[PDB]
Amino acid sequence: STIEVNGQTYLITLRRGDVLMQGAASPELTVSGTLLVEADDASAKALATRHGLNFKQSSGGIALLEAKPGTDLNAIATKLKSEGVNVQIELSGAEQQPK
C-alpha cells in the first residue's frame, strides 16, 4: 500500500522498525523511532513529556525525540503539525554511499 510520510509517498500507523520502500531504485528505509522537531530545548522538552516521547539531544535548534515501544509515530507527527510544529520522522538506511 501507499503511505504518506514527511510529505512524500512510500510503499509499505507507523511504528519503530517498520520498513518502507520508496519505489524501486532507492534503499530500503526503516522507521528508526526518532523524531526531529524544530523547537528550542525547553519547548522540545515540554513537547516530549506531553506527547509521551523522550528528549534525547539537540543541535541547531532541532531536537531528537525518541518514541517508546508501541508508539504510532505518524499519529504523533500529524498532531505536532496541527500544533504548528515542524517535525520529521527519521527514516534510516543506506542513503549515503562510498564514492
Binding site: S59, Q97, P98
Partner: protein, 597 residues
C-alpha cells in the same frame, strides 16, 4: 627519496612548478615513488601503464620545506578505519567511534570494507620506512564508521561524526568520501539536512574553522541506488548522468565539492561534474590498466582490497616481495580519493598558515589551481523546435573565464590543486572580510511567461535584482517547476556581468518519473520542489544588478536507460517518454554568499 634534501624555503629563484629541476620528495617509504598523486613522474602505480608527468597535487615544495600537516585534526567519516594499521596508528588521535558497536575502535569486520582505511592513508599515512607517505603525514586522524554495512546512518551518528560531539568538534577537516545518487529530485529543506547545514556553518565560521570536503560522485556514466545500477544506452551527448548538483548536500556551500582527475591529467572517466565543483583532485582510474591510488589497505592478506580471495591485476596485490602482509593496495580510486587528496592539501595549508580561515584557504586554492585540460570542448545538445528551428545549445561548458578574471569549468572547478602555488600565495595573503549571506529572494512566476514548451525556441526566463553591493563567492538557487520528463531540462543562471553557469545539465539521472510509471503505474514526481543548486562560476564578481534563471526543454526524442538488478543480474530497459504537455516554472529563489570588499 633519502637523496631529496630539505629546502630552506627561501632559495632565490626557486621554480615551484610541476616540471621544476628541484621537484622531488623526501622520505624512505618504500611505496612513495608509486604514489603518482604526490609526484607524477609518469609512473604506473603498479598498473599496466603510467600517465603524464606533472599531473599531481604539486606538493613537493611543501614536503621539502617541512609543511606536513602538523597540528591539523582530520575526521574520516566513512566505512571504518583500521586504527592499528602500522602505517596509520602513530597518526590516530583519541575520539574515533564505532557507531555499530559503540566502541572507540572503528576497525571493520568485513574484508571488503577497506574504503575508509584507504581514504585515511591518502591523507596521513605515516612518514617512516614502511608503506606509503601521506599527503599530510603529520596530520592526526579520527574515524567514524557511518558507512559500515550495519550502520543505519542515524542522525545522532552523523552529528557525532561531523562536529557536534566533544570528540569531533575540534577537527579542522571533515573528510566525506561519500554521496547520494538520486533518480528523483529532493528538497534540501528537510530537518535532517537543515540540522547538518547549521552544524557545518557553525563549524566552518568559528575560530580555527573546519573545512568540510565532499566527493562529487562517480556518476558520469552510471549510478547505483538500492541494489540497481542505471546507465544510459544509445548515442546521446557526452553529458554527465550524475550532475553533482543532484545530491542536495553538494549545494550547501559548507561542503567543498571535488571532482576526480586521472594520471593523464584529465577528468577520471567516472567523475561527476557540475557548477558546484570547487576543485579537481587526484583520484585515478582503477589501478589495473592505468594508475589509481596506492595507499593503506586493511591489514593482512585476509582483509581489504589487497587480499588473497580478491585478486587484482595491480602488481602490488598478493605480492610477497613488495607487500608481504598485504597492508597496502593500488586500486583505491573515485571522487572518494579526490576528497582525501583535498583534505590532505587543506591540512598542509592549515599547518603552514594556522590563522587562515576556511574561506581564506578556499580563496588560495582557487587562485592557485592549475587549468588542466585547457582545450576540452563544451558539450552541445541538438534538437529541432516546434517551429522547425534547428538549435545547438551548450549542455556543459568547457573552461570559461568570469568577469573577475577567474577561470572555471564544471569538470575541474577552478582547476587541479597546486599546493606549492597555494603556499606561495599564502605567504602574502590578506584575510577576506566576514561572510555575508544575503537573504533569499523568492520569485513566484505567473501567467504565460511560466510556460516551458517542449523543445523550446528559447529559454523560459525569470529575473531578479540584487541591490546590495557584494563580491560573490557562491550562489545558491532553489527551483520549483512542473515537467513530465525532468532530464529534458537545461537550467542556467546569468549574472549582472552576463556570465553564464549551467546549474543543471540535461539528460541527467532524474529518470524516476519513467521508473515510477514502469514499476508502479503512476508518477510521484510532478517536477522540482525547492531543488537546490550551487554555482562557483561567479567567484569574485559584483553581485549588484539583475540575475536571470533560464530553463529550456531541449529534447523530444525517446531515450532508453539500462537497469541492472545487482542481485538477480536481470537487465531491464526503461524508456523515457517525451512530455505530452508543456512544463511550468513555478518559482525560484536566489541566495548570494560573499563579502563586502
Amino acid at each position: 627519496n633519502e637523496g631529496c634534501a630539505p629546502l630552506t624555503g627561501k632559495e632565490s629563484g626557486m621554480d615551484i612548478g610541476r616540471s621544476s629541476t628541484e621537484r622531488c620528495l623526501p622520505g624512505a617509504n618504500p611505496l612513495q615513488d608509486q604514489q603518482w598523486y604526490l609526484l607524477n613522474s609518469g609512473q604506473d602505480g603498479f598498473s599496466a601503464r603510467g600517465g603524464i608527468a606533472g599531473n599531481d597535487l604539486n606538493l613537493w615544495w611543501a614536503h621539502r620545506t617541512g609543511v606536513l600537516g602538523q597540528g591539523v585534526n582530520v575526521a574520516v567519516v566513512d566505512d571504518g578505519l583500521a586504527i592499528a594499521h602500522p602505517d596509520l596508528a602513530d597518526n590516530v588521535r583519541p575520539g574515533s567511534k564505532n557507531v555499530v558497536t559503540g566502541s572507540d575502535d572503528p576497525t571493520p569486520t568485513d574484508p571488503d570494507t577497506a574504503h575508509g582505511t584507504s581514504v585515511s592513508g591518502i591523507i596521513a599515512a605515516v612518514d617512516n620506512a614502511i608503506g606509503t607517505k601521506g599527503i599530510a603525514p603529520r596530520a592526526q586522524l579520527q574515524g567514524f564508521n557511518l558507512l559500515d554495512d550495519n550502520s543505519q546512518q542515524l542522525q545522532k551518528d552523523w552529528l557525532y561524526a561531523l562536529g557536534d560531539s566533544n570528540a569531533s568538534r575540534d577537527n579542522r577537516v571533515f573528510n566525506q568520501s561519500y554521496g547520494m545518487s538520486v533518480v528523483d529530485p529532493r528538497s534540501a529543506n528537510s530537518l535532517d539536512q537543515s540540522q547538518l547545514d547549521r552544524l557545518f556553518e557553525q563549524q566552518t565560521l568559528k575560530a580555527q574553522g573546519a573545512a568540510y570536503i565532499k566527493a562529487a560522485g562517480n556518476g558520469f556514466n552510471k549510478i547505483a541506488a538500492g541494489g540497481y545500477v542505471l546507465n544510459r544506452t544509445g548515442n546521446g551527448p557526452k553529458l554527465p548522468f550524475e550532475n553533482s548538483n543532484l545530491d542536495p548536500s553538494n549545494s550547501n556551500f559548507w561542503n567543498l565539492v571535488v571532482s576526480a582527475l586521472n594520471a593523464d591529467g584529465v577528468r577520471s572517466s567516472y567523475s561527476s561534474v557540475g557548477s558546484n565543483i570547487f576543485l579537481s583532485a587526484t583520484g585515478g582510474e582503477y589501478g589495473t590498466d592505468t594508475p589509481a591510488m596506492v595507499t593503506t589497505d586493511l591489514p593482512g592478506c585476509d582483509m581489504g582490497y589487497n587480499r588473497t580471495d580478491d585478486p587484482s591485476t595491480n602488481r602490488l596485490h598478493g605480492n610477497s616481495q613488495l607487500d608481504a602482509s598485504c597492508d597496502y593496495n593500488g586500486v583505491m580510486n573515485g571522487t572518494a580519493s579526490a576528497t582525501p587528496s583535498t583534505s590532505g592539501a587543506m591540512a598542509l595549508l592549515m599547518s603552514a598558515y594556522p590563522d587562515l580561515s576556511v574561506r581564506d584557504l578556499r580563496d588560495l586554492l582557487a587562485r592557485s589551481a592549475t587549468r588542466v585540460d585547457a582545450k576540452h570542448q563544451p558539450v552541445m545538445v541538438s534538437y529541432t523546435s516546434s517551429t522547425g528551428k534547428v538549435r545547438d545549445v551548450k549542455g556543459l561548458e568547457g573552461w570559461e573565464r568570469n568577469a573577475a578574471g577567474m577561470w572555471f569549468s564544471p569538470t575541474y572547478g577552478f582547476g587541479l590543486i597546486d599546493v606549492n602555488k597555494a603556499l606561495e600565495l599564502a605567504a602574502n595573503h590578506q584575510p577576506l572580510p566576514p561572510l555575508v549571506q544575503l537573504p533569499w529572494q523568492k520569485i513566484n512566476v505567473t501567467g504565460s511567461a511560466a510556460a516551458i514548451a517542449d523543445v523550446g525556441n528559447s529559454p523560459t526566463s525569470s529575473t531578479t535584482r540584487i541591490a546590495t553591493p557584494l563580491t560573490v563567492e557562491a550562489v545558491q538557487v532553489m527551483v520549483s517547476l512542473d515537467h513530465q520528463r525532468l532530464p529534458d531540462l537545461l537550467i542556467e543562471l546569468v549574472s549582472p556581468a552576463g556570465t553564464r553557469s549551467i546549474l543543471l545539465s540535461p539528460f541527467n539521472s532524474l529518470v524516476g518519473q519513467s521508473l515510477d510509471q514502469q514499476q508502479l503505474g503512476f508518477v510521484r514526481t510532478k517536477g522540482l520542489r525547492d531543488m537546490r543548486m550551487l554555482s562557483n562560476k561567479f567567484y569574485g564578481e559584483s553581485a549588484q544588478g539583475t540575475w536571470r534563471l533560464e530553463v529550456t526543454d531541449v529534447a523530444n526524442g525517446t531515450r532508453q536507460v539500462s537497469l541492472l538488478n545487482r542481485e538477480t543480474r536481470e537487465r531491464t530497459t526503461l524508456t523515457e517518454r517525451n512530455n505530452r504537455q508543456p512544463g511550468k516554472l513555478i518559482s525560484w529563489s536566489l541566495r548570494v554568499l560573499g563579502h563586502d570588499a
